[PDB]
Design a protein around this ligand. Structure first.
Ligand code: GDP
Length: 440
């Protein structure tokens, strides 16, 4: 039932310690995407595993002694910007599900300040004494237990491997995405991953993983919408930022439009070419109305997020200064202008996720997280060139999924390059960044 997201969440968490977990319902349209029964059982079974093998259990103490050389593990290193961390952690989780491993999370500076516990009865956090923690900063493509390094140097009983899956990775790190190397990695009890990518799409190209993924996800472009909603619930101090903003500014409207504005440029602007992009997109797509210089009205709330407030200022000044062609009543709202940090950034992604129709910015993982949690197939503001308003200014995404920006392009069987975006109908080149891949 609705608190549990059609069965995706388990009941029995203590409510006061993570209010947001089951108070989604009061702020959110129910999602039209039903998790499959298979997936539900995958998630209930994972909780069982994570309980038996989790941090602090006897089995975890037993498995830990294998670091000097019936439970296996993958560890995520807190690394990169928040949006990356969300995506990448979700990917690692899917990985864990596909390899019968326990997920442990490096809490970094902030992870448990931002997210509640997602696994009933046992913490997902990596213990603070974990032997290898001090190495995490230093782990890279040239480390001795780097899988890519070992393959390159043709080395090959491993108790642990580092898996370098950062965007800068290479031909050898990429072999992670091949069946045969998966077969070998399969036997290693401790995996340590550093990554900044939503690498989910290339898992669908790995035989055996394909069959399971088809079953878990009959609707293939719901991977981040289900797993993201399962894993990420914001803590009480983040959720207060959401509820307070939503209550004060947002909850009167017949309709909500999200506009997620990321401008990848070392000058904060604001830029007139992007202002014009945003008013062309919202108008040409009938997301917001035109204004004039000469039923009964709906109220639309425009939620703008950006580092700079100039975009929201413009929209605000336009709908203030001029009547709408439609008679519609438009209000424009932006929460911050950042130029608690991480907490505001998360809240804003969750407030985006609450909108009825979302505009995103090309290449931005902030937009990916918001679209995904909300189950929103967005309109993507294309990445400009030469400070000119792209024409067309935006277009509808193929699907609500996040883009894998740095995928491998290798046919593991033939052992030769290949464009892995043109192999199956459900894995395609991204709308924003044509190099990448996403599920459709
Ligand atoms: N609060 C807030 N922070 C933002 C916004 N846009 C960018 N940021 C900050 O800059 C970071 C951008 O990195 P990331 O989250 O990985 O997303 P990306 O760089 O757009 O792909 C965000 O996490 C925020 O800390 C915004 O609209 N609101």
């Amino acid at each position: 039932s609705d608190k549990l997201l059609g069965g995706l969440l388990a009941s029995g968490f203590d409510e006061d310690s993570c209010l947001s977990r089951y108070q989604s319902v009061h702020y959110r349209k129910p999602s039209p995407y039903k998790p499959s029964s298979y997936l539900i059982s995958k998630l209930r079974n994972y909780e069982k595993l994570h309980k038996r093998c989790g941090p602090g259990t006897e089995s975890y103490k037993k498995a830990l002694k294998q670091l000097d050389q019936e439970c296996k593990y993958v560890v995520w290193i807190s690394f990169s910007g928040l949006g990356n961390r969300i995506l990448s952690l979700a990917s690692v989780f899917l990985y864990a599900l596909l390899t019968d491993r326990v997920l442990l999370v490096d809490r970094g500076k902030d992870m448990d300040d931002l997210f509640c516990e997602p696994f009933l009865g046992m913490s997902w956090l990596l213990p603070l004494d974990f032997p290898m923690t001090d190495q995490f900063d230093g782990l890279n493509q040239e480390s001795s237990r780097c899988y890519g390094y070992m393959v390159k140097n043709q080395v090959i009983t491993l108790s642990h491997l580092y898996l370098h899956l950062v965007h800068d990775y290479g031909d050898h790190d990429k072999m992670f995405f091949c069946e045969g190397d998966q077969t070998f990695i399969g036997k290693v009890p401790w995996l340590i991953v550093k990554t900044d990518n939503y690498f989910v799409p290339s898992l669908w190209l790995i035989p055996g993983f394909d069959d399971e993924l088809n079953k878990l996800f009959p609707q293939k472009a719901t991977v981040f919408h289900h797993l993201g909603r399962y894993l990420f619930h914001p803590t009480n101090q983040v959720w207060g930022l959401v509820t307070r903003y939503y209550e004060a500014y947002l909850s009167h409207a017949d309709e909500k439009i999200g506009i997620q504005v990321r401008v990848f440029d070392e000058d904060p602007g604001p830029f007139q070419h992007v202002m014009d992009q945003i008013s062309s997109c919202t108008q040409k797509e009938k997301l917001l109305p035109e204004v004039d210089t000469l039923n009964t009205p709906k109220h639309k709330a425009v939620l703008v997020t950006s580092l700079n407030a100039g975009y929201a200022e413009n929209l605000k000044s336009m709908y203030w200064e001029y009547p709408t062609s439609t008679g519609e009543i438009i209000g424009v709202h932006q929460p911050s202008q950042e130029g608690m940090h991480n907490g505001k950034a998360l809240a804003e992604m969750y407030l985006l996720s609450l909108t009825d129709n979302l505009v995103t910015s090309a290449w931005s993982t902030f937009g990916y997280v918001a679209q995904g949690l909300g189950g929103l197939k967005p309109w993507i503001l294309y990445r400009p060139e030469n400070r000119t308003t792209p024409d067309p200014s935006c277009g509808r995404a193929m699907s609500m999924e996040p883009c894998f920006h740095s995928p491998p392009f290798y046919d593991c069987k033939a052992k030769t390059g290949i464009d892995t975006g043109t192999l199956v109908p459900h894995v395609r080149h991204c709308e924003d960044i044509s190099w990448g891949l996403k599920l459709v």
